Amino acid sequence: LRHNLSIDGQPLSLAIYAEPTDPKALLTSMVQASQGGSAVLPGTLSLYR
Amino acid sequence: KIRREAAQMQVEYQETQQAHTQAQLELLQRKFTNKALYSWMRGKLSAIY
């Protein structure tokens, strides 16, 4: 009587389902980087044409 | 109840399926030859061509 059950202890009020929050999806993206050139070496002038 | 357990472990099987398909997607995006490289390809080739 105190816990509001039946004669055999079965609950008189149906327990709520408590539907979960459920998982979510994941995402990824691209990443870039930048660089410069190398020092220009003075070409040793040959004799050819 | 053993049938219920089998169904639940089927659920976790397909959940692992989704997990490693997402892993496949992310590693494919993390591969070396990718969209940034191919955009470099197309842009440089277009201009210089």
Side-chain angles (χ1 to χ4, degrees):
Chain A
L1 289 164
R2 181 258 192 274
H3 271 88
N4 191 47
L5 318 173
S6 79
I7 191 167
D8 300 333
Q10 285 86 68
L12 270 180
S13 51
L14 277 297
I16 195 170
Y17 202 66
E19 199 272 329
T21 309
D22 70 69
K24 273 76 70 177
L26 277 297
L27 71 87
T28 44
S29 308
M30 291 315 88
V31 178
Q32 279 80 236
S34 295
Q35 293 184 1
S38 68
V40 298
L41 301 180
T44 313
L45 201 49
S46 64
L47 197 67
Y48 280 80
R49 295 207 173 120
Chain B
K1 80 185 52 156
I2 303 162
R3 269 187 282 270
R4 177 255 191 280
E5 192 275 339
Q8 177 49 239
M9 61 80 70
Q10 164 54 240
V11 183
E12 74 90 21
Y13 157 93
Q14 66 181 355
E15 170 56 25
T16 303
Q17 183 159 2
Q18 192 184 12
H20 63 240
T21 50
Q22 178 56 69
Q24 183 62 242
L25 197 64
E26 64 90 21
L27 65 87
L28 196 47
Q29 298 145 340
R30 288 305 100 188
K31 295 287 96 176
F32 167 56
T33 47
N34 50 25
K35 187 99 185 198
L37 172 72
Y38 290 155
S39 287
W40 271 122
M41 297 299 103
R42 72 192 306 164
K44 279 195 242 184
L45 294 174
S46 284
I48 297 152
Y49 166 82

